[PDB]
Scaffold this active site. Structure first.
Site, PDB file in Angstrom:
ATOM      1  CD  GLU A  59      -2.502   1.555   2.442  1.00 46.63           C
ATOM      2  OE1 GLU A  59      -1.741   2.345   3.037  1.00 46.63           O
ATOM      3  OE2 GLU A  59      -3.617   1.202   2.891  1.00 46.63           O
ATOM      4  CG  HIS A  60       3.432   2.340   3.311  1.00 48.20           C
ATOM      5  ND1 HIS A  60       4.085   3.227   4.141  1.00 48.20           N
ATOM      6  CD2 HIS A  60       2.340   1.922   3.991  1.00 48.20           C
ATOM      7  CE1 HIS A  60       3.416   3.340   5.274  1.00 48.20           C
ATOM      8  NE2 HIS A  60       2.353   2.558   5.208  1.00 48.20           N
ATOM      9  CD  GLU A 136       2.717   4.678   8.144  1.00 47.56           C
ATOM     10  OE1 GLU A 136       2.254   3.533   7.957  1.00 47.56           O
ATOM     11  OE2 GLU A 136       2.556   5.644   7.357  1.00 47.56           O
TER      12      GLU A 136
END
Lengths: 443, 48
Positions: A59-60, A136
């Protein structure tokens, strides 16, 4: 122009499938602006133990550039057309979508296609994002609510794939290989499992022609056309108590296995969760709030907030509630909460369901407050329910629900069931699984 | 010296039977509830 009618007026959602398997769907509005995206049927549930965290690492990178158009090339092209690109990755559903001028409808699809298919996966960037995700995590770890739901899954679905976090392990993030991210993409981001959805001022036909153009996947063997069926996740009446008397408030979440998207009871479950509702210290309502729990919460300063939930999944799900409280009112709160649950199974009143149904419809409508949300409903409906479900239908289904039905269904899923518990913080007051297990009956 | 002699014993018989059946059912019950604690696992995960 009564509500009923406005419902049967909303344009139908069109769906057309390609030879590769990709399913294109959309709801056309006059909106000058719009939203289009690809809703893949992949998540951390598809990941196994060795690659837990791939779909998130991936996703990153779906935004750091493709083979054709590298980093700046991508961003520049996208930033400069006043478009917003963004996405997410759940346990069993991943999504990537853009918010652009209905005008750019076709260039966007090209862009979407270029992301799900030709992600650069620049091994240089990979090592950077590795440090970002790791960062994160440090942050998300300070989100009690998250920690609490992850844990909830961690024990309710212990031993299965659904008991993993989406973000994955600190080890996997530290070691995943370009190759891993690579295959993840190849194995999951596949046509028959993806759904190109759009909403706004867009021609379904124009939409699908664009789809044909860049979403030109090929399928030779049967294997490719097939959608795998995941192994069933076993629910377990259990509890996980992560205690830290140093945190200000305590989080508590309790739940029972839910049916799954397909099951019609879900409607009834929602109507029920609609009765108990949710609360929070800034709800103007106050002592007069309709939800007894909320009301009780207010009268006794039982919690900084509470909320019911019915998290659905393909074959399973979690039906429960979560509350944040002070160390010394955790018990009274838990007590009252189970109280209302038992009341749901034994004495729901017609007046309650009436209010509940109205409140529900209202939420149902807010689920389609913009091209993006609408889009999200399409992508998900097709993905989950197979087809699209119109408010006119939902509304229909909802109306069928009545006290008796709520009680039967709730009894069915709640009464005398071994719940799953997750507690975090200064949780000494709330206690004993047994004492809580007995709260599951009589009411 | 003890007419009850016979009944006293017949009762003893019934007593033993019930006592067995009952002590058993209650051992199971005690265990059941306590399993929550018996198999309970814990861990010390200090922060870093």
């Amino acid at each position: 122009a009564t509500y009923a009618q406005t419902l049967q007026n909303i344009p139908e959602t069109n769906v057309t499938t390609l030879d590769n398997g990709l399913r294109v769907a959309s709801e056309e509005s006059s909106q000058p602006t719009c939203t289009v995206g690809v809703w893949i049927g992949a998540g951390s549930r598809y990941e196994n133990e060795k690659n837990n965290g791939a779909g998130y690492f991936v996703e990153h990178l779906a935004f750091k550039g493709t083979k054709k158009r590298p980093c700046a090339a991508f961003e520049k092209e996208v930033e400069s057309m006043g478009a917003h690109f963004n996405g997410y990755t759940s346990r069993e559903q991943t999504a990537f979508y853009i918010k652009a001028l209905s005008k750019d409808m076709p260039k966007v699809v090209e862009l979407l296609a270029d992301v799900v298919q030709n992600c650069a996966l620049e091994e240089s960037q990979i090592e950077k994002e590795r440090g970002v995700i790791l960062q994160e995590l440090k942050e998300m770890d300070n989100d009690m609510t998250n920690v609490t739901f992850d844990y909830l899954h961690a024990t309710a679905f212990q031993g299965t794939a659904l008991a993993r976090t989406v973000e994955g392990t600190t080890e996997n993030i530290k070691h995943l290989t370009r190759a891993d991210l690579a295959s993840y993409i190849d194995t999951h981001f596949k046509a028959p499992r993806m759904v190109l959805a759009a909403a706004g001022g867009i021609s379904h036909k124009e939409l699908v022609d664009a789809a044909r153009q860049h979403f030109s996947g090929v399928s030779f063997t049967y294997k490719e056309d097939a959608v795998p069926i995941l192994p069933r996740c076993r629910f377990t009446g259990s509890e996980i108590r992560a205690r830290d008397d140093a945190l200000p408030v305590a989080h508590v979440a309790l739940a029972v296995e839910g049916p799954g998207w397909a099951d019609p009871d879900n409607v009834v479950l929602h109507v029920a969760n609609a009765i108990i509702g949710r609360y929070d210290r800034t709800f103007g309502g106050g002592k007069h709030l309709s939800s007894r729990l909320a009301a009780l919460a207010v009268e006794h300063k039982l919690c900084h907030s509470f909320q019911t939930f019915n998290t659905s999944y393909s074959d399973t799900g979690l039906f429960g509630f979560h509350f944040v409280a002070d160390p010394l009112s955790i018990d009274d709160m838990m007590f009252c909460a189970q109280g209302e649950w038992m009341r749901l199974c034994t004495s729901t009143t017609e007046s309650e369901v009436k209010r509940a149904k109205n409140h529900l419809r209202s939420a149902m409508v807010a689920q389609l407050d913009g091209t993006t949300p609408v889009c999200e409903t399409i992508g998900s409906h097709l993905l989950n329910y197979g087809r699209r479900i119109s408010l006119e239908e939902w509304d229909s289904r909802i109306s069928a629900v009545d006290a008796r039905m709520v009680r039967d269904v709730c009894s069915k899923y709640i009464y005398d069931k071994c719940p799953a518990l997750a507690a975090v913080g200064p949780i000494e007051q709330l206690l004993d699984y047994n004492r809580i297990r007995s709260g599951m009956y009589w009411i | 010296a003890e007419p009850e002699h016979d009944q006293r014993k017949r009762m003893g018989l019934k007593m033993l039977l019930i006592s067995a059946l009952l002590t058993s059912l209650l051992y199971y019950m005690k265990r059941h509830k306590w399993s929550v604690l018996k198999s309970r696992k814990m861990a010390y995960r200090p922060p870093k």
